[PDB]
Curated annotation (Swiss-Prot), chain A:
DNA-binding region in chain numbering: 52-71
Residue segments, region Sigma-70 factor domain-4: 30-78
Annotated function: Sigma factors are initiation factors that promote the attachment of RNA polymerase to specific initiation sites and are then released. Extracytoplasmic function (ECF) sigma factors are held in an inactive form by an anti-sigma factor until released by regulated intramembrane proteolysis. Over-expression of SigL induces 19-28 genes including polyketide synthases, secreted and membrane proteins. Might play a minor role in regulating SigB.
Induction or repression: Expressed during growth in culture; expression increases from lag to exponential phase. Has a weak SigL-independent promoter, is also weakly autoregulated, no other sigma factor allows its transcription. Forms an operon with rslA.
Oligomer status and interactors: Interacts transiently with the RNA polymerase catalytic core formed by RpoA, RpoB, RpoC and RpoZ (2 alpha, 1 beta, 1 beta' and 1 omega subunit) to form the RNA polymerase holoenzyme that can initiate transcription. Interacts (via sigma-70 factor domain-4) with anti-sigma-L factor RslA.
Protein family (similarity comment): Belongs to the sigma-70 factor family. ECF subfamily.
Residue span relative to the full protein: 90 to 177 of 177
Name this protein carries in UniProt: ECF RNA polymerase sigma factor SigL
Curated annotation (Swiss-Prot), chain B:
Protein's name according to its UniProt entry: DNA-directed RNA polymerase subunit beta'
Inducers of expression: 6-fold repressed by starvation.
Function per UniProt: DNA-dependent RNA polymerase catalyzes the transcription of DNA into RNA using the four ribonucleoside triphosphates as substrates.
Full-protein interval shown: 830 to 878 of 1316
Subunit structure: The RNAP catalytic core consists of 2 alpha, 1 beta, 1 beta' and 1 omega subunit. When a sigma factor is associated with the core the holoenzyme is formed, which can initiate transcription.
Gene: rpoC
Species, as recorded: Mycobacterium tuberculosis (strain ATCC 25618 / H37Rv)
Membership in a protein family: Belongs to the RNA polymerase beta' chain family.
Swiss-Prot record, chain C:
The protein's assembly and partners: The RNAP catalytic core consists of 2 alpha, 1 beta, 1 beta' and 1 omega subunit. When a sigma factor is associated with the core the holoenzyme is formed, which can initiate transcription.
Entry similarity comment: Belongs to the RNA polymerase beta' chain family.
Organism: Mycobacterium tuberculosis (strain ATCC 25618 / H37Rv)
Residues shown, of full length: 1220 to 1268 of 1316
Name of this protein: DNA-directed RNA polymerase subunit beta'
Its job: DNA-dependent RNA polymerase catalyzes the transcription of DNA into RNA using the four ribonucleoside triphosphates as substrates.
Inducing stimuli: 6-fold repressed by starvation.
Curated annotation (Swiss-Prot), chain E:
Similarity comment: Belongs to the RNA polymerase beta chain family.
Origin organism lineage: Bacteria, Bacillati, Actinomycetota, Actinomycetes, Mycobacteriales
Organism of provenance: Mycobacterium tuberculosis (strain ATCC 25618 / H37Rv)
Recorded catalytic activity of this chain's protein: RNA(n) + a ribonucleoside 5'-triphosphate = RNA(n+1) + diphosphate
EC number(s) reported in the record: 2.7.7.6
Effect of I120A: Weakens interaction with TRCF and CarD
GO cellular component assignments: cytosol; DNA-directed RNA polymerase complex; peptidoglycan-based cell wall; plasma membrane
Function: DNA-dependent RNA polymerase catalyzes the transcription of DNA into RNA using the four ribonucleoside triphosphates as substrates.
Protein name: DNA-directed RNA polymerase subunit beta
Subunit structure as annotated in this protein's UniProt entry: The RNAP catalytic core consists of 2 alpha, 1 beta, 1 beta' and 1 omega subunit. When a sigma factor is associated with the core the holoenzyme is formed, which can initiate transcription. Interacts with CarD, TRCF (Mfd) and RbpA.
Length: 88, 49, 49, 292, 1126, 96
RNA sequence: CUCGA
DNA sequence: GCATCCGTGAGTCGAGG
DNA sequence: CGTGTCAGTAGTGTCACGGATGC
C-alpha cells in the first residue's frame, strides 16, 4: 500500500528523554545517600538485571542477605524521594 | 516592447476597461519572472559562497 | 571531495573520488560544518581558540 | 583523459576489479524503515523494493543455474539482475526508471544524496535545532537598538530548563520533576522567575531569506505581553522586513562562548554599518527621516 | 436601486451604464457538468430547448460506446442500456458525521445476446454506489467536502509551430496531431530541408516511409508534393522503397523484438490510427481538424476517427508553410489560411469540467471490466451465463474511488469564508493529468492572453509558484458542450447597440471586432464617436469607425472574477495590489457578528446567495414558526417546508460556519429570497469584515511601514472577534499485549486533573480546557521487558504493582484553549464499523473565542495588508471634535508607493455614507451631480452604496459629496471638503497641527492570527532516522537553521554558535541529553560530540560500495562504537 | 569519541570488503510476518543479521532479560544488544 | 497539493 | 574531423493535507 | 495441484550549457 519515500506518510518520531533524564538524575542523587552495600546491590539487581542468587554468588554473601539488602535499600530510596517531593 | 498606445488616464482619474486589461499584461509577467530571477540569483549566490 | 560532493554533481564527484582514492584533510569551513568541528575562521582559528 | 583514469588505478594500488561486483551490500534496516499505518496495512521504503527485486531475480538465477536451463533463459535472467542492481544503486540512470505504484520513480540509494532533498544539503549543511521558535514580528518604537520584545509564552518554553532550575533553587518546587510540571502547567510563580532568567541573556533573531550576515542579529530579550515579536524599527533595513505578516525565528545560545559571540560579534548595536559598502543601515529610513 | 429582483436590501449604485444581462448562476460550471453526466431531467430539458435531437448523457454515452462486447467469433454478445439511480444512500450531514461518501446506487439493464442459440436473457444489474454532487456543487468523500476543479488542457486537433533552429538559424516548422485518446503523431521539417515523422515518441522516420506503408505509390507521391523541392529531396534521400517494405520498417521501430509479418503491421497501422478501438478524435477534436485543414467543413460530424485524407492534407499544410506560403485548399476542400497556432489561445485551449473528468474515469473503469467480460465469456459455459456472471464491478468502483480519493482536480474544499468556497468551485487549473507539469511550464503559459477577456480573470491568481497556472472564471463566462469558454456580447447590427445577446467562443470572438463596455451610446443605440476603442484579434486595441463595430461587451466587470468584481474603485488600483486584494478577500475570517460594507459594488449580494452558505426560500409563503434551530415556511398551496440552521459547525479550515435566521414569525417572503444568512453575511450580502473609523497619519512609530494601530474598542465590543473550532481525535486499538481502553483511571494522576472528565474518561461538555489538559483518557499496556532499569527501580521504590499500562491520553496541543462544545463516540461494541483493529473512537470539538490580538493580520480590499502593531486604550486614540475616537490608524507612507488610491477614495466615500449628504437643489442641479442618479442626491447616515468595477463613482462627484456632508447631532461638520478633519492627541490633549484624512474603511480579519502562528520549543520529538528535531508546529518541532543561515554564522565568525547549532542543539544523541542535565544542574555546557546524521551519511556511502574511513593524525582508521564481522 | 581526526579516506569497496562488513547474507526476499510483526529469518529485516527488534529481546523469545548480555542465541542466532545496532550493522547479497 | 514573507 | 545528445543545474522559511 | 480456440504498451508544453558520444 505505502512507501515512506512517497508523500502522505507520517515519518517516525522518537520522544525526548527529558522525563527519563530527570528520573535518572534523582535516582543518582538518592543512590549517593545509600551505604556502599545497599548501593552495590540495587545496582546489581536493577542496573545489571541479575538474579537473587547471582548477586549472592558475586558478593560472597547469603541468599537472604541479598533479599534483605534489596528490601531495605528500596525503602531507603523511597524515603529520600518522598523527602524531596517525588510523585508516587 | 511598449504598446503603441499608452494608458492616458491616471489612477486618480480611473483607467478604462481596455486600459486596465493591457496594464495587467506587464503587471503579471513582472511578478512572474521575479521568481525565476531570484532563483538564478540565489543559485549564483551559493556558487559564489 | 566532501566540500565538492555537497555542492554540485554529487555522483560525478563521488565516482572520481573513489577511483582516485582521494583522502580529504578535514580542514575547511564546509567540512567542519558537516562533521561538527569548530570552523577554522573567526573564533575557531588556533590563535584565538 | 584515458591516462587520467588509468594512472589512478596504477599509482593507488587498488585494483579496477572493484567496478564489477560479486556481492552488493545491504544498508541497515533503520535507514530503510518499514512503518505500520493506522489503517492496519504497512509502508516500506523504496530501497526495500529494490533490494527485494535484486533478491528475487538473484534467487531465480540460482534456480536456472542448478536446473541447467537453456542459455537463453540464464542470459536473459542475468541481464535483469544487472538492471536490478543498477536500479538499486541509481534507478533511472539508464533507460526508463523502475516505476512503483502510480508511475512514481523509486528512490535509489544515490537519490539519498542528490540535490536539495539529498542528505548533504537537507541534513548536513542545514539542520533543525532545539531551543528555537518563530512568531509574527511587530514594530516596537520604544525598544532600544540592542533590545527586542518577545512574548512571555515563547520565553517560558525557550528558557524551560533554566526556569526549572531556578524554580527548584528558590524552593518554589520541591524537586526538578515537579518543577517541570510547574512550567508545563504555567504556575504563576514562573512569570516572576522567568524575568530573572532572561536577564542579559542575548537571543538571535532571523528573517529568511538570510541574504547577508545581518539577516541574523542578536538582541536583549524583554518580556512583553501578547504573542508577537517586537522588532526595533532601525534593524528593519538589514532584515528587509516589512510588517505585513512576516515571521522571524528566535534561537537561544546556550554555551558561554555562544552568548559571548552574540553579545560582541552579533549584537545589533555593534553592526550599524553595512559590511558590503560601509554606509550605515540602522538610520532613519521612513517615518523618522520625514519627522526630522 | 441595485439588484431589485430577490427582495434584498436597497443598495444605491453609482451606475451610468445599464446592465443588459444579469449575472448567470455562479455555480453553473460545477452544476451543469454533473447534470449532463448523470442525465438529469433539467439537463435533458435544457438540451431539448437547445435544439438537440436525441441527446445523450455522459453515462449513456459511455454505455453506447462500450456496447456491444463480442469475442473473436461473434457467438457471444453483451450490451448495456438504461442507466438509472435509486435514492441517495444517506443525507449530506450524515455522511459528514459518520465519515462516509455521498452516493446513490447506479442501476443499468444488461443482456446477453447469443447468436449460436437464438435466445437472450435481459435483467437489471447494479453497477456501483455512484458519488453524487451536492446542491452546493461539492462532493463528500469520507465525510469531507471536496471540489472537482475544472482543468485547462490542450484541445484535440492539429497544431502547427514556427520554431527557430539553434545552430543554422533557419526558420523551422513542426506539426502535432493530438488525439482525444490513443497514439500521437508529429511531423516536422528539420534543418536539412527534409520531412520526417515521429510515431508515438518512437524514432523519426522519413515522411515517405509512412506514405509507402499506407499503399501510396512512389509516383503519386511526386504528383502530390511536386511543387516543393524539400519533398523531392525527401523521397530521394529515402532509404527503403516498397509498400510491403516501409510497412515492416514501421513495425520494427514501433514494436521491436517481434517477427514482422506484412499483415501484423497491416493490422496495427489500421488499429492505432483508423479503428475506433485504439484511436478517437472527439466531436470537438474532429471539428477542430475539419476547420484547421478546411475539409468536410459542411458534413455532419459523424467520423469519430482519423482518416488517411487528413494525414495527407496535414503534410500538405506543413510543406506549404515551410516555404512561405499563406493559403491552401485541400483537393476537394474549402480554402484555409496556412499559419501556426497559439496553443495558448482559448480556442485551442480547452476546459473540461466535472462531468468529463468523471466520465473519463468511468470509461477507464468500464474498459477494465470489459476485459473481465471477454475473459469470463470464453471460460464459462454458453448456456448458464447471465449478465450477473459476466460483470465484476470491482475495477469500476475502484476507478472512481481512485479518482475522487487521489487527484489534483479532486481538491480539499477551501472553506475559510463563503467567497473562498465559491471561488474554489470556479477555479480553472492548468496543472494535473493531461495538462502540464509545474517543471514543464514557461513564462508563456502563465501570463495573460488576449482571448482571456471575459472568460478567465486576469487579476485573481496566486502569487506563489502557481501563478498563471490557476485562474478564476470570469463572471458572465460559461462553458459550451465542446469544452471552450463562451462569453456574452451585444450584437451591433449597423452601428446600433441591440439588446440581443449571443455567446461567442474564443475563435468566434476573433472573427469580429468588439467595442469596449464603457462606450458613449445614444439612447437609440448609435455610437457617439465615429472612432471608438475596439479590441481586435491578436490583442490589438485601436479606434475604428462606428459602422465597423460588430459586438460590444455586456458589463464593465465582464473580464474580472467574482472576487475581483467585489473591489470598489478597482480602476484606481494597480493590478499587483488588486491581485492581493482579491486573494486576501478569500482569506477573511467569519466574525461573531457580521457587518455589510458601507462602500460596496453590488456583487456582494449575488456572491453570497450563489455561494450556498445562506438559506434561500425555495417557494413563496409565510413563516409559520421561527427558532434558532429551524425555520418553517407555510406555502400558498398548503405544504410546509422546514429549513434547518447549521449552528456552530466547524469548516474545513477551522472557521465557524454559523447560520442565523433573518425573518420573524408571520413574514410574507417571496421565492428565492434570503430567509437566513450564514458566515460572512449580513442581510444576504458578503460581509468579509467591518466598517472601521480610519485616520491616515503616522502615530509615534507604532504604525511603521505597514504596521497597524487599533482601538481597544474593537476588543471590548467584539468587533474583530471570531469563533474558531478545532477537531481532536483518538482511538483505542488492539495491541500486542492487550487492548487500549478509554478509562478515567489513569496511573499516577491526581483526582484534580481528572475532575473535568466523566465516568468514561472523556472531558464533559462545557468544560474550559487549556493546553496540556486531558481530553480522552487512554491507557496502553506496555510489556515488562520494555522497562528502563531506572523505571523498574522506580516502580519497585513506590510499591505500585499492576501498573503494566502507560499513559497515552489525548491532551490539548500547545497553543489551544477553549470550551468543549461537542463529543462524538464510536464503538465497535455498539455496531459502529471502525477500521479493523480499533475498539473505540472519540472526537472532541473545542471552540475558542478569539478576540483581535497584537500581530493578527488585517487587510483591506486593495491589497493593503498589515499586522496589528499596538492596541492602545480608547483614550489614547486620536479622537475627533465630538470625542468619538478613531478605530484604526493607518500609516501614510505605505499609500503612494503601492499605487492603491482606491483605499483613499473608499475612505472618502466611506465617510459620506457614514454621515450622509444633501445636494443643493435650489437654482437647479449643480454641475458635478448632473450625471448622478436622482436617488443619490440625498442620503441618510449609514447608507449603503455600490461602486461597480470600471463604473461607479467618479472623483468629480466624490469631491462634490465631501462638500455637502451631513452634520452630526450637534449640527457641526467634522470633515472638510478636502476630506480631512481636525484630530486631538489623546495622550497629551493638544490638537494635531494639521487636518488628517478621516473616514470609514472596510477592514477584513484574515486567517493569519498569532494564536496559530506562534511557536517555540525547548526539546521534543526527533525524526527517528536522522535524529534531528521534527518539523512543523503541529509536530512540536524546531526551526530549521538552513544553509543560508550557516553562511551568516561563518560571515560573523561565530564558530561556537555554529558548532552549538549543528551538534548539541540538533542531532547529537548524547550531547543534547548532557546539555539538558548541565542546565538543570547549573553546570557548564559540555563539549559537542559527533552528529548522528554524519554517521548515517557514512553508512549510506558504504551501501553504495564506497570504502569510507576516518583517519587520525597518525593515520590509523578509527571506528564509531561499532565493528565488523564476516 | 573526540572530534579531532585529520583525514577522511574514500576508496573502491572490494567485493571482499562487502563481506567483511556484512553480518550475514540476505537470502530470502521476505520482510516480516504481517501478524506477529516478527521479521522472517534471513529476510531483509532478519534479527540474526541486523539486530534485535527490541532491546535484549531475541527472536525465539528465550532470552528477554538484560542479564544475558552478549549471548548468541543457539535456536534463532540473534545477538542480544540494544536495537541501536539495527542502524549500523550491514548486510549483503551474494550474487550468482 | 494549497497558501503566507 | 564535427554535429549530436546526454547530463547537469535551476532562492530561503513557514502553515494545513 | 495445473493452466491452453485470437487474446497486445504508459505517456507525451522547461531550458541553458558544456563535453563526451557518435556517423
Ligand atoms: Zn533466541
Amino acid at each position: 500500500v505505502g512507501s515512506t519515500d512517497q508523500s502522505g506518510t507520517p515519518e517516525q518520531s522518537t520522544p525526548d528523554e527529558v522525563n527519563a533524564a530527570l528520573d535518572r538524575l534523582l535516582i543518582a542523587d538518592a543512590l549517593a545517600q545509600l551505604s556502599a552495600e545497599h548501593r552495590a546491590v540495587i545496582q546489581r539487581s536493577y542496573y545489571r538485571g541479575w538474579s537473587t542468587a547471582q548477586i549472592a554468588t558475586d558478593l560472597g554473601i547469603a541468599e537472604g542477605t541479598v533479599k534483605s539488602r534489596l528490601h531495605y535499600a528500596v525503602r531507603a530510596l523511597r524515603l529520600t524521594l518522598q523527602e524531596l517531593g517525588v510523585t508516587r | 516592447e511598449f504598446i503603441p498606445r499608452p494608458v492616458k488616464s491616471s489612477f486618480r482619474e480611473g483607467l478604462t476597461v481596455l486600459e486596465y486589461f493591457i496594464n495587467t499584461h506587464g503587471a503579471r509577467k513582472g511578478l512572474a519572472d521575479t521568481a525565476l530571477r531570484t532563483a538564478d540569483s540565489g543559485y549564483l549566490t551559493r556558487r559564489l559562497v | 571531495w566532501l566540500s565538492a560532493a555537497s555542492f554540485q554533481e554529487t555522483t560525478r564527484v563521488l565516482t572520481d573520488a573513489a577511483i582516485n582514492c582521494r583522502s580529504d584533510k578535514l580542514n575547511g569551513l564546509k567540512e567542519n560544518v558537516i562533521i561538527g568541528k569548530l570552523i577554522p575562521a573567526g573564533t575557531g582559528i588556533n590563535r584565538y581558540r | 583523459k584515458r591516462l587520467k583514469v588509468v594512472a589512478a588505478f596504477q599509482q593507488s594500488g587498488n585494483s579496477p576489479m572493484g567496478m564489477v561486483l560479486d556481492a552488493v551490500p545491504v544498508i541497515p534496516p533503520e535507514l530503510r524503515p518499514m512503518v505500520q499505518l493506522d489503517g492496519g496495512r504497512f509502508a516500506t521504503s523504496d530501497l526495500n523494493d529494490l533490494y527485494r527485486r535484486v533478491i528475487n531475480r538473484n534467487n531465480r538465477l540460482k534456480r536456472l543455474i542448478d536446473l541447467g536451463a537453456p542459455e537463453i533463459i540464464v542470459n536473459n535472467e542475468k541481464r535483469m539482475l544487472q538492471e536490478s542492481v543498477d536500479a538499486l544503486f541509481d534507478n533511472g540512470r539508464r533507460g526508463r526508471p523502475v516505476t512503483g505504484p502510480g508511475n512514481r520513480p523509486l528512490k535509489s540509494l544515490s537519490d539519498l544524496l542528490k540535490g536539495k532533498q539529498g542528505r548533504f544539503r537537507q541534513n548536513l549543511l542545514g539542520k533543525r535545532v532545539d531551543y528555537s521558535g518563530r512568531s509574527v514580528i511587530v514594530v516596537g518604537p520604544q525598544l532600544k537598538l540592542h533590545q527586542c520584545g518577545l512574548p512571555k509564552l515563547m520565553a517560558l518554553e525557550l528558557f524551560k530548563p533554566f526556569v526549572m532550575k531556578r524554580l527548584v533553587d528558590l524552593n518554589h518546587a520541591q524537586n526538578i520533576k515537579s518543577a517541570k510540571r510547574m512550567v508545563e502547567r504555567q504556575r504563576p510563580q514562573v512569570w516572576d522567575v522567568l524575568e530573572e532568567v532572561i536577564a542579559e541573556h542575548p537571543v538571535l533573531l532571523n528573517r529568511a531569506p538570510t541574504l547577508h550576515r545581518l539577516g541574523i542579529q542578536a538582541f536583549e530579550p524583554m518580556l512583553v505581553e501578547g504573542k508577537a515579536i517586537q522588532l526595533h524599527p532601525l534593524v528593519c533595513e538589514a532584515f528587509n522586513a516589512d510588517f505585513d505578516g512576516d515571521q522571524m525565528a528566535v534561537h537561544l545560545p546556550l554555551s558561554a562562548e555562544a552568548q559571548a559571540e552574540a553579545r560582541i560579534l552579533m549584537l545589533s548595536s555593534n553592526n550599524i554599518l553595512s559590511p558590503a559598502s560601509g554606509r550605515p543601515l540602522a538610520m532613519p529610513r521612513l517615518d523618522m527621516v520625514t519627522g526630522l | 436601486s441595485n439588484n431589485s429582483v430577490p427582495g434584498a436590501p436597497n443598495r444605491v449604485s453609482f451606475a451610468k451604464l445599464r446592465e443588459p444581462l444579469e449575472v448567470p448562476g455562479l455555480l453553473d460550471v460545477q452544476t451543469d457538468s454533473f447534470e449532463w453526466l448523470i442525465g438529469s431531467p433539467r439537463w435533458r430539458e435544457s438540451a431539448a430547448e437547445r435544439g438537440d435531437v436525441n441527446p445523450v448523457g455522459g453515462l449513456e454515452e459511455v454505455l453506447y460506446e462500450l456496447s456491444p462486447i463480442e469475442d473473436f467469433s461473434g457467438s457471444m454478445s453483451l450490451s448495456f442500456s438504461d442507466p438509472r439511480f435509486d435514492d441517495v444512500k444517506a443525507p449530506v450531514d450524515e455522511c459528514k458525521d459518520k465519515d462516509m461518501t455521498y452516493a446513490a446506487p447506479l442501476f443499468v439493464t444488461a443482456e446477453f445476446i447469443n447468436n449460436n442459440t437464438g435466445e437472450i436473457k435481459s435483467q437489471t444489474v447494479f453497477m456501483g454506489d455512484f458519488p453524487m454532487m451536492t446542491e452546493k456543487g461539492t462532493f463528500i468523500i469520507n465525510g469531507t467536502e471536496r471540489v472537482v476543479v475544472s482543468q485547462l488542457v490542450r484541445s484535440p486537433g492539429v497544431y502547427f509551430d514556427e520554431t527557430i533552429d539553434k545552430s543554422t538559424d533557419k526558420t523551422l516548422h513542426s506539426v502535432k496531431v493530438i488525439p482525444s485518446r490513443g497514439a500521437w503523431l508529429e511531423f516536422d521539417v528539420d534543418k536539412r530541408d527534409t520531412v520526417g515523422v515521429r510515431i508515438d515518441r518512437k524514432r523519426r522516420q522519413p515522411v515517405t516511409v509512412l506514405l509507402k506503408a499506407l499503399g501510396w505509390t512512389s509516383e503519386q507521391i511526386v504528383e502530390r508534393f511536386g511543387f516543393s523541392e524539400i519533398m523531392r529531396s525527401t523521397l530521394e534521400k529515402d532509404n527503403t522503397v516498397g509498400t510491403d517494405e516501409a510497412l515492416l520498417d514501421i513495425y520494427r521501430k514501433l514494436r521491436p523484438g517481434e517477427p514482422p509479418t506484412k499483415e501484423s503491421a497491416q493490422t496495427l497501422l489500421e488499429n492505432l490510427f483508423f479503428k475506433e478501438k485504439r484511436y478517437d478524435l472527439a466531436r470537438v477534436g474532429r471539428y477542430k481538424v475539419n476547420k484547421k485543414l478546411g475539409l468536410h467543413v459542411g458534413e455532419p460530424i459523424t467520423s469519430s476517427t482519423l482518416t488517411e485524407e487528413d494525414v495527407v492534407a496535414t503534410i500538405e499544410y506543413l510543406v506549404r508553410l515551410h516555404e512561405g506560403q499563406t493559403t491552401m485548399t485541400v483537393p476537394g476542400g474549402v480554402e484555409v489560411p496556412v499559419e501556426t497556432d497559439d496553443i495558448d489561445h482559448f480556442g485551442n485551449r480547452r476546459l473540461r469540467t466535472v462531468g468529463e473528468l468523471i466520465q473519463n474515469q468511468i470509461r477507464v473503469g468500464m474498459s477494465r471490466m470489459e476485459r473481465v467480460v471477454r475473459e469470463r465469456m470464453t471460460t464459462q459455459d454458453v448456456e448458464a451465463i447471465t449478465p450477473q456472471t459476466l460483470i465484476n464491478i470491482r475495477p469500476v468502483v475502484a476507478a472512481i474511488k481512485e479518482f475522487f480519493g487521489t487527484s489534483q482536480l479532486s481538491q480539499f474544499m477551501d472553506q475559510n469564508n463563503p467567497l473562498s468556497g465559491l471561488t474554489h468551485k470556479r477555479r480553472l487549473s492548468a496543472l494535473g493529468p493531461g495538462g502540464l507539469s509545474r517543471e514543464r511550464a514557461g513564462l508563456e503559459v502563465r501570463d495573460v492572453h488576449p482571448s482571456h477577456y471575459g472568460r478567465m480573470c486576469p487579476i485573481e491568481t496566486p502569487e506563489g509558484p502557481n501563478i498563471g497556472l490557476i485562474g478564476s472564471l470570469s463572471v458572465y463566462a460559461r462553458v459550451n458542450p465542446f469544452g471552450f469558454i463562451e462569453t456574452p456580447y451585444r450584437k451591433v447590427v449597423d452601428g446600433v447597440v441591440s439588446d440581443e445577446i449571443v455567446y461567442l467562443t474564443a475563435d468566434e470572438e476573433d472573427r469580429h471586432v468588439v467595442a469596449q463596455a464603457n462606450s458613449p451610446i445614444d439612447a437609440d443605440g448609435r455610437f457617439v464617436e465615429p472612432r471608438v476603442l475596439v479590441r481586435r484579434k491578436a490583442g490589438e486595441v485601436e479606434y475604428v469607425p462606428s459602422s465597423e463595430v460588430d459586438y460590444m461587451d455586456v458589463s464593465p466587470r465582464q473580464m474580472v472574477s467574482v472576487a475581483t468584481a467585489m473591489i470598489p474603485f478597482l480602476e484606481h488600483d494597480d493590478a499587483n495590489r488588486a491581485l492581493m486584494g482579491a486573494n486576501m478577500q478569500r482569506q477573511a475570517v467569519p466574525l461573531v457578528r457580521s457587518e455589510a460594507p458601507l462602500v460596496g459594488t453590488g456583487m456582494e449580494l449575488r456572491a453570497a446567495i450563489d455561494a450556498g452558505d445562506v438559506v434561500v426560500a425555495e417557494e413563496s409563503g409565510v413563516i409559520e414558526e421561527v427558532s434558532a434551530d429551524y425555520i418553517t415556511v407555510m406555502h400558498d398551496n398548503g405544504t410546509r417546508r422546514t429549513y434547518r440552521m447549521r449552528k456552530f459547525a466547524r469548516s474545513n479550515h477551522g472557521t465557524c460556519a454559523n447560520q442565523c435566521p433573518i425573518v420573524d414569525a408571520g413574514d410574507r417572503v417571496e421565492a428565492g429570497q434570503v430567509i437566513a444568512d450564514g458566515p460572512c453575511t449580513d442581510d444576504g450580502e458578503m460581509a468579509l469584515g467591518k466598517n472601521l473609523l480610519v485616520a491616515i497619519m503616522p502615530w509615534e512609530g507604532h504604525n511603521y511601514e505597514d504596521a497597524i494601530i487599533l482601538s481597544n474598542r474593537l476588543v471590548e465590543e467584539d468587533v474583530l472577534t471570531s469563533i474558531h473550532i478545532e477537531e481532536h481525535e483518538i482511538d483505542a486499538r488492539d495491541t500486542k499485549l492487550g487492548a487500549e481502553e478509554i478509562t478515567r483511571d489513569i496511573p499516577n494522576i491526581s483526582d484534580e486533573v481528572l475532575a473535568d472528565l466523566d465516568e468514561r474518561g472523556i472531558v464533559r461538555i462545557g468544560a474550559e480546557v487549556r493546553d496540556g489538559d486531558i481530553l480522552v483518557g487512554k491507557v496502553t499496556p506496555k510489556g515488562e521487558t520494555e522497562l528502563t532499569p531506572e523505571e523498574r527501580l522506580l516502580r519497585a521504590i513506590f510499591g505500585e504493582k499492576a501498573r503494566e499500562v502507560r499513559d497515552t491520553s489525548l491532551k490539548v496541543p500547545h497553543g489551544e484553549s477553549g470550551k468543549v462544545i461537542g463529543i462524538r463516540v464510536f464503538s465497535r461494541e455498539d455496531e459502529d464499523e471502525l477500521p479493523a483493529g480499533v475498539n473505540e473512537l472519540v472526537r472532541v470539538y473545542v471552540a475558542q473565542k478569539r478576540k483581535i490580538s497584537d500581530g493578527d493580520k488585517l487587510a483591506g480590499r486593495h491589497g493593503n495588508k498589515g499586522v496589528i502593531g499596538k492596541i492602545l486604550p480608547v483614550e489614547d486614540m486620536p479622537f475627533l471634535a465630538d470625542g468619538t475616537p478613531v478605530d484604526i490608524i493607518l500609516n501614510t507612507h505605505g499609500v503612494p508607493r503601492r499605487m492603491n488610491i482606491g483605499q483613499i477614495l473608499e475612505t472618502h466615500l466611506g465617510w459620506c455614507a457614514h454621515s450622509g449628504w444633501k445636494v443643493d437643489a435650489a437654482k437647479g442641479v449643480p454641475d458635478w451631480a448632473a450625471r448622478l442618479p436622482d436617488e443619490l442626491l440625498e442620503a441618510q447616515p449609514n447608507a449603503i452604496v455600490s461602486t461597480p468595477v470600471f463604473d461607479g463613482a467618479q472623483e468629480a462627484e466624490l469631491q462634490g459629496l465631501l462638500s455637502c456632508t451631513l452634520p452630526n447631532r450637534d449640527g457641526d461638520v467634522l470633515v472638510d471638503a478636502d476630506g480631512k478633519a481636525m484630530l486631538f492627541d489623546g495622550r497629551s490633549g493638544e490638537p494635531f497641527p494639521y487636518p488628517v484624512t478621516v473616514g470609514y474603511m472596510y477592514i477584513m480579519k484574515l486567517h493569519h492570527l498569532v494564536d496559530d502562528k506562534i511557536h517555540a520549543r525547548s526539546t521534543g520529538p526527533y525524526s527517528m532516522i536522522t535524529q534531528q528535531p521534527l518539523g512543523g508546529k503541529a509536530q512540536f518541532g524546531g526551526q530549521r537553521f538552513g544553509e543560508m543561515e550557516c553562511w551568516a554564522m561563518q560571515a560573523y565568525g561565530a564558530a561556537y554558535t555554529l558548532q552549538e547549532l549543528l551538534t548539541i542543539k540538533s542531532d547529537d544523541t548524547v550531547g543534547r541529553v548532557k546539555v539538558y542535565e548541565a542546565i538543570v544542574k547549573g553546570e557548564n555546557i559540555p563539549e559537542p560530540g559527533i552528529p548522528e546524521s554524519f554517521k548515517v551519511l557514512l553508512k549510506e556511502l558504504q551501501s553504495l560500495c564506497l570504502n569510507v574511513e576516518v583517519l587520525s593524525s597518525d593515520g590509523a582508521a578509527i571506528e564509531l562504537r561499532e565493528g565488523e564481522d564476516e | 569519541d573526540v572530534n579531532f581526526f585529520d583525514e577522511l579516506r574514500i576508496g573502491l569497496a572490494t567485493a571482499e570488503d562487502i563481506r567483511q562488513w556484512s553480518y550475514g547474507e540476505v537470502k530470502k526476499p521476505e520482510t516480516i510476518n504481517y501478524r506477529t510483526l516478527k521479521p522472517e529469518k534471513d529476510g531483509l529485516f532478519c534479527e540474526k543479521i541486523f539486530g534485535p527488534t527490541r532491546d535484549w529481546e531475541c527472536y525465539c523469545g528465550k532470552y528477554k532479560r538484560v542479564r544475558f548480555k552478549g549471548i548468541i542465541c543457539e535456536r534463532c542466532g540473534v545477538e542480544v544488544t540494544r536495537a541501536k545496532v539495527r542502524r549500523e550493522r550491514m548486510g549483503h547479497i551474494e550474487l550468482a
